[PDB]
A paper describes a structure:
Since it's discovery and subsequent use as a genetic protein tag, Green Fluorescent Protein (GFP) from Aequorea victoria has become one of the most important and powerful tools in cell biology. In the case of wt GFP Ser65, Tyr66 and Gly67 main-chain atoms cyclise after the protein folds to form, in the presence of O2, the highly conjugated planar p-hydroxybenzylideneimidazolinone chromophore. The crystal structure of wild-type GFP (wt GFP) revealed that the chromophore is packed within the core of the GFP β-barrel structure protecting it from quenching through water dipoles, paramagnetic oxygen or cis-trans isomerisation.
Crystals grew in the space group P212121 and contained a single molecule in the asymmetric unit. The crystal structure of EGFP displays the traditional β-barrel structure with the chromophore located in the core of the protein. The most obvious effect of the F64L mutation comprises the exchange of the bulky and buried phenylalanine side chain for a smaller leucine side chain in the central chromophore containing helical structure. Replacement of Ser65 with Thr results in the hydroxyl group of Thr65 in EGFP occupying a different position from the corresponding hydroxyl group of Ser65 in wt GFP, probably as a result of steric effects due to the additional methyl group of Thr65. The hydroxyl group of Thr65 now donates a hydrogen bond to the backbone carbonyl of V61 instead of Glu222. In contrast to other S65T-GFP structures the electron density of the Glu222 carboxylate side chain in EGFP suggests that it occupies two distinct conformations.
Residue numbers in the entry: 3 to 64, 68 to 231
Write the structure that this text describes.
């Protein structure tokens, strides 16, 4: 059963290849997750030089199996139920009055390590918009991630609105639409409607000269009562 894989601290690896308006880049991340506490700690490095988009815009793309599901909601945890074989996670992310990301990721175990491998494609960005113009603050807001079953794909459909602070005090909306499908043919938990409540803190390693992001995140499932 997939839930038993997450009772302790699990090492995480993230690998992303991206192309945003023809700017090609790669990101590698390492850290660990402790789903008992809904906790993630990770450090990401841009391995190709300078990241051509703001780090915050990649947070959602860069492992919802580490969410804390309350005991009374554990029959609604799709993400862990798909493990260890994993799931495909696909998104379209529409940046208001700007371009979009489309992403396809596979999240699964490689031995004891939870791996997220992603291909990201961004098109229609404005050269001097908030994304390619690097006008977004280095911080991150707290969100609600809404989950429902998608029975005909044997998976889930997920929607939410990310709010990225702009350096002028305004907000850059990033509308997220997501689909997750299991990779194995084994049974998964197709959940009742509920949501995940997220919080993330971004920081820098004062000794790191590469372009990077340190992330501490807590996520708790909610919306189904005792
Ligand atoms: Ca700036
Ligand atoms: Ca039900």
């Amino acid at each position: 059963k997939g839930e038993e894989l997450f009772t302790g601290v699990v090492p995480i690896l993230v690998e992303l290849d991206g192309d945003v308006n023809g700017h090609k880049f790669s990101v590698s991340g390492e850290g660990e997750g402790d789903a008992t506490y809904g906790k993630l700690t990770l450090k990401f490095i841009c391995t190709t030089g300078k990241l051509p988009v703001p780090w915050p815009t990649l947070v959602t793309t860069l492992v919802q199996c580490f969410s804390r599901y309350p005991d009374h909601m554990k029959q609604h945890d799709f993400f862990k139920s798909a493990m260890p074989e994993g799931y495909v996670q696909e998104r379209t992310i529409f940046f208001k009055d700007d371009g979009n990301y489309k992403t396809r990721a596979e999240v699964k175990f490689e031995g004891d390590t939870l791996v997220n491998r992603i291909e990201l494609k961004g098109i229609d960005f404005k050269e001097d918009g908030n994304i390619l113009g690097h006008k977004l603050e280095y911080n991150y807001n707290s969100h609600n991630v809404y989950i429902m079953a998608d029975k005909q794909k044997n998976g889930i459909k997920v929607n939410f609105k990310i709010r990225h602070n702009i350096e002028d005090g305004s907000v850059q909306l990033a509308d997220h639409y997501q689909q997750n499908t299991p990779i194995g043919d084994g049974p998964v938990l197709l959940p009742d409607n509920h949501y995940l409540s997220t919080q993330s803190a971004l920081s820098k390693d004062p000794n790191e000269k590469r372009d990077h992001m340190v992330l501490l995140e807590f996520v708790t499932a909610a919306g189904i009562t005792l």
